[PDB]
């Protein structure tokens, strides 16, 4: 009776109702998967580019390939718009500065053309080299540009004034809401000339990322003052700060209290303090008591996103902690450096940080008096950690992180192990097996015992892993460590740390060990980041040698060994050759620069697009 | 909720808030297994949204236009994230195929297609 069906003349799909098509797209975040979709039919392809949210547009606005394009390229729903990466990578885009009236009915064409194919634009990210690029560009999103992101890698240009960067927006989008400043380089006094001067439109901020690209020493609480007052309606606020009190201007126990006053609705709040290994504060005390982080906790009860990454110490922070719990019920995400004194579980019970049962991520840098008791009283008060790491606790030990492991079965999915005294590797590995096949990401440096490896069972979950290195340390130990079967593992991030004049130079025909994952099935994207490691082609052969027998490397961003001397990084001849062999390749950043043609990566590995120089270093170049 | 199908918790669709002559007596009864499930006061919640989800593409589909004149939006997410993760990593043909597509472009017309998809990174 039930026969099978034959050919059919009808689609399913395009039998739909164009706004059921319309959401289906929607769900579709694959780039690749959405450019494949409007390959399909015709009417796929109005269904992608009508429900496409976001975009990063790839070449030369001011080529003409662009600018002569049809109106079926076209996204009405695009709200977020990314014209950072840009190619070239760095120069003003829509610049007023010349390198005289030609060039202002250019920018004005490639201002008009982008609001075409992106006419509601609520979220904007551009290389911001000069603020002629904010004012040639807002124009025609001016009325809807809720969100805008700034990138500057770039010197600062010295003639500007204080607070140039900023006014262009300030002056012109009067629905901006969110600023993100954290790539975006410029002096600390930029950032307040121009907030505390413009009471009209920073009175409307809700979202400020004040990191600077890592270039300022923090600001200071005669700056974070003026800039906290100017905004009472800040929920987010990530920025820097100067916490040394060997600085009269530093940050301490009047200037959290005085920022917690200016911003009573802040949410989340990432306060960090600038790392330099030349002072190298271990244990030097800041101007943070508890006694005032109470007072500053009770000033914030909407807080649910609190980061005070520190390097000077915070001393018996446990009673801080518990007025966290109390004052701030809806606290989630924790993550503190350098506090002391967080846990002392002496008494039972659950001081300390194990008060606050709400925690779903915690994170505890420089720990020195965090031990197997503390840790063993978190895992009775915090049962939703999902999220849990230690970074430089030297008294925690295998039995700790194994009972914790333990008892956070259920909830405990990625775990970050940084640098902690008592933990190795292959040890450490071997303590995370009651959620070897549960956790999801992991965060390790890694540490050999020369005696268990060459010189057990399947992470079924684990699809991300982090790994931090030393200078001429080898990564071949990882798989008889513990890491010999990992399934879904598909991207690893690799950094090297440490001098490279002081390692003794590794024995020739000897290599990092890349060529080691391959036993990895998935193993698709890889961040190999030697920035911090430093005959320098003798070292990118030592840490490159290999990577071609990845067969399924898909995506691949490469940061090269920094110069002594040198302003340019730049690809050792042999460097290029390692990842010309690369021949799974579909994306190839490398931040840095190369004397080969960027052509003769395409010719060597077929399936590649997506290639860039960035070069979000700092000290940027500048290249023309 | 005595619910009468078409061809013989009632409240997750707001075109409830009966006659249903648009939904068969088989796609309804996935329907109202979907709301039984959910209205529960985590991963086996969206373990069996997986697992209710195994079903056939001419099933599927008769799921989405259910969901979409019923107004129940938990339901109408569902069923289109799994058309939309069936069209990832397929390349255009792969995508004809699954869904019996056919190819109406020019070949400048797809040739305009591939050039407009050079300006997005991936």
């Given at each position: 009776?039930e026969?099978?069906?034959?050919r059919?003349?009808?689609?399913?799909?395009l039998?739909?109702?164009?706004?059921?098509?319309?959401?289906?797209?929607?769900?579709?975040?694959d780039?690749?998967?959405r450019?494949?979709?409007?390959?399909?039919?015709g009417?796929?392809?109005?269904?992608?580019?009508?429900?496409?949210?976001?975009?990063?547009?790839r070449?030369?606005?001011?080529?003409?390939?662009?600018?002569?394009?049809?109106?079926?390229?076209?996204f009405?729903?695009?709200?977020?718009?990314?014209?950072?990466?840009?190619?070239?990578?760095?120069?003003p885009?829509?610049?007023?500065?010349?390198?005289?009236?030609?060039?202002?009915?250019?920018?004005?064409?490639?201002?008009?053309?982008?609001?075409?194919?992106?006419?509601?634009?609520?979220?904007?990210?551009?290389?911001?080299?000069?603020?002629?690029?904010?004012?040639?560009?807002?124009?025609?999103?001016?009325?809807?540009?809720?969100?805008?992101?700034?990138?500057?890698?770039?010197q600062?240009?010295?003639?500007?004034?204080?607070?140039?960067?900023?006014?262009?927006?300030?002056?012109?989008?009067?629905?901006?809401?969110?600023?993100?400043?954290?790539?975006?380089?410029?002096?600390?006094?930029?950032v307040?000339?121009?907030?505390?001067?413009?009471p009209?439109?920073?009175?409307?901020?809700?979202?400020?990322?004040?990191?600077?690209?890592?270039?300022?020493?923090?600001?200071?609480?005669?700056?974070?003052?003026?800039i906290?007052?100017?905004?009472?309606?800040?929920?987010?606020?990530v920025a820097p700060?100067?916490?040394?009190?060997?600085?009269?201007?530093?940050?301490?126990?009047?200037?959290?209290?005085s920022?917690?006053?200016?911003?009573?609705?802040?949410?989340?709040?990432?306060?960090?303090?600038?790392?330099?290994?030349?002072?190298?504060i271990?244990?030097?005390?800041?101007?943070?008591?508890?006694?005032?982080?109470?007072?500053?906790?009770?000033?914030?009860?909407?807080?649910?996103?609190?980061?005070?990454?520190?390097?000077?110490?915070?001393?018996?922070?446990?009673?801080?902690?518990?007025?966290?719990?109390?004052?701030?019920?809806?606290?989630?995400?924790?993550?503190?450096?350098?506090?002391?004194?967080?846990?002392?579980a002496?008494?039972?019970?659950?001081?300390?940080?194990?008060?606050?049962?709400?925690?779903?991520?915690?994170?505890?840098?420089n720990?020195?008096?965090?031990?197997?008791?503390?840790?063993?009283?978190?895992?009775?008060?915090?049962?939703?950690?999902a999220?849990?790491?230690?970074?430089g606790?030297?008294?925690?030990?295998?039995?700790?992180?194994?009972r914790?492991?333990?008892?956070?079965?259920?909830?405990?999915?990625?775990?970050?192990?940084?640098?902690?005294?008592?933990?190795?590797?292959?040890?450490?590995?071997?303590?995370?097996?009651?959620?070897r096949?549960?956790?999801?990401?992991l965060?390790?440096?890694?540490?050999?015992?020369?005696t268990?490896?060459?010189?057990?069972?399947?992470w079924?979950?684990?699809?991300?892993?982090?790994?931090?290195?030393?200078?001429?340390?080898?990564?071949?130990?990882l798989?008889?460590?513990?890491?010999?079967?990992?399934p879904?593992?598909?991207?690893?991030?690799?950094?090297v740390?440490?001098?490279?004049?002081?390692?003794?130079?590794?024995?020739?025909?000897?290599?990092?060990?890349?060529?080691?994952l391959?036993?990895?099935?998935?193993?698709?994207?890889?961040?190999?980041?030697l920035?911090?490691?430093?005959?320098?082609?003798?070292?990118?052969?030592?840490?490159?040698?290999g990577?071609?027998?990845?067969?399924?490397?898909y995506?691949?961003?490469?940061?090269?060994?920094?110069?002594?001397?040198?302003?340019?990084?730049?690809?050792?001849?042999?460097?290029?050759?390692?990842?010309?062999?690369?021949?799974?390749?579909?994306?190839?950043?490398?931040?840095?620069?190369?004397?080969?043609?960027?052509?003769?990566?395409?010719?060597?590995?077929?399936?590649?697009?997506?290639?860039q120089?960035?070069?979000?270093?700092y000290?940027?170049?500048?290249?023309? | 909720?005595?619910?009468?199908?078409?061809?013989?918790?009632?409240?997750?669709?707001?075109?409830?808030?009966?006659?249903?002559?648009?939904?068969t007596?088989?796609?309804?009864?996935?329907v109202?297994?979907?709301?039984?499930?959910?209205?529960?006061?985590?991963?086996?919640?969206?373990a069996?949204?997986?697992?209710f989800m195994?079903?056939?593409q001419?099933?599927?589909?008769?799921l989405?236009?259910?969901?979409?004149?019923?107004?129940?939006?938990?339901?109408?997410?569902?069923?289109?994230?799994?058309?939309?993760?069936?069209?990832?990593?397929?390349?255009?043909?792969?995508?004809?195929?699954?869904?019996?597509?056919?190819?109406?472009?020019?070949?400048?017309?797809?040739?305009?297609?591939?050039?407009?998809?050079?300006?997005?990174?991936?």
């Open positions: 009776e026969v099978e069906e034959g059919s003349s009808s689609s399913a799909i039998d739909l109702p164009e706004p059921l098509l319309l959401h289906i797209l929607s769900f579709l975040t780039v690749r998967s450019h494949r979709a409007a390959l399909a039919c009417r796929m392809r109005a269904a992608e580019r009508a429900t496409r949210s976001e975009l990063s547009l070449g030369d606005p001011r080529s003409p390939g662009f600018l002569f394009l049809s109106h079926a390229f076209r009405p729903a695009l709200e977020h718009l990314d014209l950072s990466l840009v190619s070239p990578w760095g120069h885009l829509l610049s007023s500065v010349p390198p005289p009236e030609a060039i202002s009915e250019q920018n004005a064409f490639i201002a008009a053309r982008l609001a075409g194919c992106f006419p509601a634009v609520t979220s904007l990210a551009v290389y911001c080299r000069d603020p002629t690029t904010l004012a040639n560009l807002t124009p025609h999103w001016q009325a809807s540009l809720r969100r805008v992101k700034l990138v500057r890698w770039h600062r240009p010295p003639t500007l004034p204080d607070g140039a960067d900023l006014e262009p927006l300030l002056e012109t989008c009067a629905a901006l809401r969110e600023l993100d400043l954290s790539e975006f380089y410029c002096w600390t006094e930029d307040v000339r121009a907030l505390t001067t413009h009209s439109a920073t009175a409307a901020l809700t979202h400020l990322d004040l990191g600077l690209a890592a270039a300022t020493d923090g600001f200071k609480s005669s700056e974070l003052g003026p906290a007052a100017s905004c009472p309606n800040l929920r987010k606020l700060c100067l916490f040394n009190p060997r600085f009269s201007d530093c940050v301490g126990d009047d200037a959290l209290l920022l917690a006053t200016s911003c009573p609705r802040l949410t989340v709040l990432r306060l960090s303090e600038p790392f330099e290994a030349a002072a190298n271990q244990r030097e005390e800041a101007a943070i008591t508890v006694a005032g982080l109470v007072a500053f906790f009770a000033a914030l009860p909407a807080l649910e996103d609190f980061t005070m990454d520190l390097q000077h110490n915070v001393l018996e922070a446990a009673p801080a902690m518990e007025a966290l719990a109390r004052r701030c019920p809806r606290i989630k995400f924790l993550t503190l450096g350098s506090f002391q004194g967080l846990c002392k002496s008494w039972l019970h659950l001081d300390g940080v194990a008060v606050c049962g709400g925690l779903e991520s915690l994170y505890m840098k720990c020195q008096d965090l031990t197997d008791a503390s840790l063993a009283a978190i895992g009775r008060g915090c049962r939703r950690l999220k849990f790491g230690i970074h606790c030297d008294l925690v030990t295998s039995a700790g992180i194994r914790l492991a333990f008892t956070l079965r259920p909830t405990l999915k990625e775990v970050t192990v940084l640098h902690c005294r008592l933990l190795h590797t292959a040890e450490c590995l071997t303590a995370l097996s009651p959620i096949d549960r956790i999801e990401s965060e390790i440096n890694c540490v050999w015992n020369t268990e490896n060459l010189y057990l069972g399947s079924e979950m684990l699809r991300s892993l982090s790994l931090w290195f030393s200078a001429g340390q080898l990564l071949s130990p798989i008889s460590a513990g890491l010999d079967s990992c879904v593992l598909e991207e690893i991030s690799i950094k740390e440490g001098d490279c004049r002081t390692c003794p130079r590794p024995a020739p025909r000897t290599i990092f060990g890349l060529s080691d391959a036993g990895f099935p998935v193993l698709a994207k890889m961040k190999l980041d920035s911090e490691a430093v005959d320098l082609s003798l070292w990118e052969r030592f840490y490159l040698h990577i071609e027998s990845l067969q399924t490397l995506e691949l961003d490469y940061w090269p060994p920094q110069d002594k001397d040198v302003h340019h990084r730049s690809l050792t001849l042999p460097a290029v050759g390692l990842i010309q062999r690369c021949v799974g390749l579909r994306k190839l950043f490398i931040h840095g620069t190369t004397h080969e043609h960027f052509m003769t990566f395409f010719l060597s590995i077929p399936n590649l697009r997506d290639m120089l960035r070069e979000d270093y000290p940027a170049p500048e290249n023309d | 909720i005595v619910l009468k199908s078409s061809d013989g918790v009632a409240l997750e669709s707001q075109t409830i808030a009966v006659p249903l002559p648009n939904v007596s088989k796609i309804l009864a996935k109202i297994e979907y709301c039984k499930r959910h209205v529960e006061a985590d991963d086996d919640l969206k069996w949204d997986a697992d195994k079903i056939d001419a099933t599927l589909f008769e989405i236009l259910a969901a979409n004149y019923l107004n129940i939006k938990n339901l109408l997410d569902l069923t289109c994230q799994t058309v939309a993760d069936m069209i990832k990593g397929k390349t255009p043909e792969e995508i004809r195929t699954t869904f019996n597509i056919k190819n109406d472009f020019t070949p400048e017309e797809e040739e305009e297609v591939r050039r407009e998809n050079q300006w997005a990174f991936e």
